[PDB]
Design an enzyme around this catalytic site. Structure first.
Site, PDB file in Angstrom:
ATOM      1  N   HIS A 188       0.777  -1.229   0.000  1.00 20.41           N
ATOM      2  CA  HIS A 188       0.000   0.000   0.000  1.00 20.41           C
ATOM      3  C   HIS A 188       0.812   1.284   0.000  1.00 20.41           C
ATOM      4  O   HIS A 188       0.240   2.341  -0.209  1.00 20.41           O
ATOM      5  CB  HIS A 188      -1.008   0.005   1.176  1.00 20.41           C
ATOM      6  CG  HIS A 188      -0.381   0.346   2.530  1.00 20.41           C
ATOM      7  ND1 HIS A 188      -0.114  -0.590   3.481  1.00 20.41           N
ATOM      8  CD2 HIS A 188       0.037   1.566   3.061  1.00 20.41           C
ATOM      9  CE1 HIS A 188       0.433  -0.003   4.550  1.00 20.41           C
ATOM     10  NE2 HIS A 188       0.530   1.323   4.297  1.00 20.41           N
ATOM     11  N   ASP A 201      -0.421  -7.648   1.728  1.00 21.55           N
ATOM     12  CA  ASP A 201      -0.070  -6.240   1.618  1.00 21.55           C
ATOM     13  C   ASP A 201       1.448  -6.091   1.500  1.00 21.55           C
ATOM     14  O   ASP A 201       2.044  -5.223   2.160  1.00 21.55           O
ATOM     15  CB  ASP A 201      -0.622  -5.415   2.810  1.00 21.55           C
ATOM     16  CG  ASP A 201      -0.456  -3.887   2.602  1.00 21.55           C
ATOM     17  OD1 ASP A 201      -0.363  -3.435   1.436  1.00 21.55           O
ATOM     18  OD2 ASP A 201      -0.458  -3.148   3.603  1.00 21.55           O
ATOM     19  N   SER A 213       4.643   2.715   7.924  1.00 19.08           N
ATOM     20  CA  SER A 213       4.499   1.423   7.225  1.00 19.08           C
ATOM     21  C   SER A 213       5.808   1.028   6.553  1.00 19.08           C
ATOM     22  O   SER A 213       6.390   1.827   5.775  1.00 19.08           O
ATOM     23  CB  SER A 213       3.448   1.507   6.113  1.00 19.08           C
ATOM     24  OG  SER A 213       2.155   1.519   6.657  1.00 19.08           O
TER      25      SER A 213
END
EC number: 3.4.21.90
Length: 152
Positions: free
Chosen positions: A29, A51, A103
């Site tokens: 993402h 992901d 992230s």
């Protein structure tokens, strides 16, 4: 240096990629380009289920990569913003210690081995539960997602 900023077109840091065990790995993402000449234009393979996306680590960076470990006993771990508790199958941090742009950052044990890659966090008040990728002894990826996870 085994952790690389992923930058949007303005050059803002969107999240991180890591060199680990012969791969470059980043959360799928996190949109942008890895801020490294050897890494920018690699061919990535994408897994929506986890992901994550990965590419083969360029042979120049062969030795400059994290080791991964499946040993995650309960206790405390490390990441860029401080302590990460692991207990009851969950990684938690003080709410506010992590947020957008984190992230892809690794969680490390004290020997400097990666135990997980951060995807996001679910705010539980005092504590925030981290949604993460880990790998088991067979090398199978595992995505742990908590209720109301916020992608970082």
């Amino acid at each position: 240096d085994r952790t690389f900023a992923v930058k949007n077109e303005d050059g803002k840091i969107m999240g991180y990629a890591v060199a680990m065990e012969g791969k470059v790995i980043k959360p799928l993402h996190v949109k942008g380009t890895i801020d490294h000449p050897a890494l920018a234009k690699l061919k990535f393979t994408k897994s929506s289920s986890y992901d994550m996306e990965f590419a083969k680590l360029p042979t120049e960076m062969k030795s400059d990569a994290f080791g991964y470990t499946t040993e995650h006993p309960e206790g405390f771990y490390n990441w860029h913003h401080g302590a990460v508790q692991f207990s009851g199958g969950r990684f938690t941090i003080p709410t506010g210690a992590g947020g957008p742009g984190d992230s892809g950052r690794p969680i490390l044990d004290n020997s400097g081995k990666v135990v997980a890659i951060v995807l996001g966090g679910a705010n539980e008040g005092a504590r925030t539960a981290l949604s993460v990728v880990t790998w088991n002894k067979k090398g199978a990826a595992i995505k742990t997602t908590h209720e109301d996870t916020v992608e970082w």
